[PDB]
């Protein structure tokens, strides 16, 4: 008539369901961060359907695949021929991509920079994903490690 093995299983179920639910909220957050910066850094202007195609694939770290694409359309729309966008955009795009270095001089050659800022960016959402993950992991295990124990105690009294 003892509650031993039950609690051990209720906490085990508490952690795993905890971690699982955290990881899914972490991943969906990371994705919104990437999404958000992809527009902050004006990459919408380099490729417009950039957000929906990173959206429609989950796995935020799959933004790095778009780097050669970004390189191609930067040179296309901000090249020495004049470019497609305005000079004020291009200036900003170039600073955000880490190629042209705010105060004027060159930064790094457009081939190293683009992947560098994208990897910086996913590493930036990794930190923000591993945070929301840890958080809802504790927050869901508590509320279910509580709901269970509240239901095991009522099982025992009778």
């Amino acid at each position: 008539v003892w509650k031993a093995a039950a609690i051990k299983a209720a906490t085990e179920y508490a952690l795993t369901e905890g971690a699982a639910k955290g990881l899914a909220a972490g991943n969906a957050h990371g994705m919104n961060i990437v999404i958000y910066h992809l527009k902050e850094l004006l990459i919408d202007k380099l490729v417009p359907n950039i957000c929906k195609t990173v959206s429609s694939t989950g796995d935020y770290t799959r933004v790095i695949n778009f780097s050669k694409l970004i390189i191609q359309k930067r040179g296309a729309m901000c090249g020495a021929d004049g470019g497609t966008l305005s000079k004020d955009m291009c200036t900003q795009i170039n600073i955000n991509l880490g190629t042209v270095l705010r105060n004027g001089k060159a930064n790094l050659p457009d081939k190293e920079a683009v992947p560098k800022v994208l990897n910086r960016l996913v590493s930036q959402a990794d930190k923000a994903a591993n945070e929301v993950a840890k958080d809802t992991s504790q927050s869901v295990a508590v509320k279910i490690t509580e709901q269970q124990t509240a239901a095991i105690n009522a099982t025992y009294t009778s």
Binding site: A80, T91, A106, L108, D110, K111
Partner: protein, 98 residues
């Protein structure tokens, strides 16, 4: 340490409206990326398609098909030889007759 680049135009620097021109950046051996600059902050092109023009130097080539009088004016070269950029070449002035 590393020599400043040279810029030139082909066929020349004086090119009729609508015609074609080809900027030729060159610097030493072992250049990874060339950058052709027009207003170095906003508008520029980077190429990895570097060719060798001599035992001593290498060159990349950038080309505009139909030259607008917009396209007139200044241009310069830079090359990136890891881990650092070169100083900036001397100005080339492209002239386009109305």
């Amino acid at each position: 340490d590393l020599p400043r680049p040279s810029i030139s135009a082909e066929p020349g620097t004086v090119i009729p409206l609508g015609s074609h021109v080809t900027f030729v950046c060159r610097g030493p051996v072992g250049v990874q990326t060339f950058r052709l600059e027009r207003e170095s902050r906003s508008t520029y092109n980077d190429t990895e398609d570097v060719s060798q023009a001599s035992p001593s130097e290498s060159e990349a080539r950038f080309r505009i098909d139909s030259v607008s009088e917009g396209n007139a004016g200044p241009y310069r070269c830079i090359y990136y030889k890891p881990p650092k950029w070169s100083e900036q070449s001397d100005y080339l002035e492209l002239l386009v007759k109305e």
